[model samples]
Target: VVSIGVFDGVHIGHQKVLRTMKEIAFFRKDDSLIYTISYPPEYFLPDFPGLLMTVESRVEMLSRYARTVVLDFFRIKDLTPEGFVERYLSGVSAVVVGRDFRFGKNASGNASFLRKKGVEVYEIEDVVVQGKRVSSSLIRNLVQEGRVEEIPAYLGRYFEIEGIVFPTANIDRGNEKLVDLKRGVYLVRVHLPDGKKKFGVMNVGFRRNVKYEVYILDFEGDLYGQRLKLEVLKFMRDEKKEELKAAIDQDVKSARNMIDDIINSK
Candidate 1:
């Protein structure tokens, strides 16, 4: 069995499709495959929004469900709908897709198109949470608007990004294309490579460059060259250019009690 989509960010709606595909594949005693696109079709448009998360992260999340196959959209962009089916999908026994799934040149293939081709297709319907549809676009908007606290309801987890910590005391995303999250001070949880977790205050603002500056509460170590995963929790405030040190001192003081309470409760 196979599932197809961009699966961007692996939000709850995409999770639903993956879970359903797993169930069907298990019952059929066949392995499941995820056919993912490296980039969404909108990526070529003039007003294309930035990516929600990197494809590497998306593939890592997807591998928890099944083996994955990533296809380059540019390489197959000119294939006709029938040609796409013949070239890549001739061996697929069964397929799964979202209600809005489209493919092939000009996106002429729909679930109905697959059915017409004598393929078994499972079309997962839209997923709604609290009266709002759970979608990548909605999550992207929330991230862009600095509403990270509300993203877990739709994404099934905190908005997160993984990067390498440098000796310069900042995290580097290393060419990863990320959503343009609103620049501000944010409360976050950092996962250290040494298997430790700490609450940190992060600043997503202009420095010598657009950087993620992290101050992990009560943490001390030589962290250069280590990987850190930052899970954004809540927006604190915007950047303070003149009173930078004073503002950060205030943030650390204010967050100390809350971070203590959170860790103690856990």
Candidate 2:
């Protein structure tokens, strides 16, 4: 099976399409290949700027779902629609796309076009929730609007910001810099690894500082070279001086709740 598109955020809709493709590939015992363009097709206007995941992250996510191949612009951009199929998808038994999929230089290709060319084609309908289509563009729009809580439903998981910790002068201030992240206190699930110990931290502060870091409560060991993935589960109200103090108190309460939930789940 061959699947094509620039699946940017890898949101619920993309997962639905890929999952369906995987089922077909597994049932047929054939290789599942995901063929994505490196760059967005210029003819299509994008709804937002920046991306939820880097190309590397996209590849990593795709790897979890299929044997993936990315086509560089030079490989697919100038090729005719038929040329794209013949060269990249020639051996594939089936081609799978999303309901709104389009292709070629001027957005001319469709499922019908591929069918006419002797390619077995399938289209997964848009996955919708709460009367809205589950799409990367929708997720991006919600993120830009700072509606972080609404994201996870469409994403099938929390939005995460991962980075490495480095030394900074403000280490004494109890501040953790979630590097390059939008400044805020978040309900974060922080993944940590020590010798035989692996656990997650909640309500960690990723404050702005001269350097990037994360400050966890109580449990502290040498994390100078540690890599961390902070999954933002929900957006609590913005922090003010008094509100910040109150929020931190609530975070403490939430942390306890999370611990109980985790223990119970186990």
Candidate 3:
């Protein structure tokens, strides 16, 4: 069996597709493969913004549920819809996709086309939230608008970004794209190197370098050059500067309580 999509953020919709693919494969006593493609195919769209989550991150999450085959843009961009399926996706007895899924040159392939080729097709429909469909674009819009707190509702988890923590008490995202997340005040969960979480507040430059500058709760330690993952939980407000410091103490308190509530409710 095979499941395929770009799966930019692996949002709830992708989760459903993956789950259904695995369930079908398990019932048939067969293995399943997730064939993913990196998008917006910069070779095609020279101005493509970028991926919401890194390919490495996507593969990690995918491996948690099934083996994945990540196809590079340059590698498969030339394959025809039929040729691509026959060459790379052949031998899979069953295939799964989303309601809006399409593929190949000019996206001429659909579930109907797949069935015509004798492949079992499973079309997982859209996952909706509050009247709108849960999609990578919606998530990106929310993050861009500094509505990071609303991400969990759509993504089924917090919006996370990773980097290496330096001795200067800062984190560098390096070349990793933030997509369009605006620079501002944020409530974040800092996943420490020692497998600990610290609820805190962070700030990004109004329009400068894209980096995760953190203040990890009431916890502090020697965290030089250690990689850390920060999950954005809430968008408190934009950078208030001279007016920001006073509000942060209170914001941190609120962030701490929210984390506590989340843990206790579980």
* C-alpha lDDT values of all predictions: 0.84, 0.65, 0.77
TM-score of each: 0.93, 0.74, 0.86
For residues 193-264, what per-residue lDDT tens digits would candidate 3 score against the true structure?
768877767877643446567788767676787888888878876766566556766767777777788889
Tell me model 3's lDDT, rounded to 2 decimals: 0.77
Which tens-of-lDDT digit does each residue in 108-182 have in candidate 1? 888788889998999998799999999988999998898999999999999986778611258887774567668
Tell me the tens digit of each residue's lDDT in model 2 across 107-203.
6777888888887787888988999988766776676555677887898887766555511212221222112224344555666664433323233
What's the lDDT of the predicted structure labeled candidate 2? Answer: 0.65
By TM-score, who's the top model here?
1
Weakest 10 consecutive residues, lDDT, candidate 1? 160-169
Q: Which 10 consecutive positions of candidate 2 have the poorest summed lDDT?
A: 169-178
Q: If both were scored by TM-score, which would come out higher, candidate 2 or candidate 3?
A: 3
Write the number of the candidate with greater lDDT, choosing between 1 and 2.
Answer: 1
Candidate numbers sorted by TM-score from highest down: 1, 3, 2
Residue pairs in collision within model 2: 177-213
Model 2 alpha-carbon drift over 4 Å, by segment = 26-29, 42-47, 166-183, 194-213, 239-266
Clash counts per candidate, in order, are 0, 1, 0
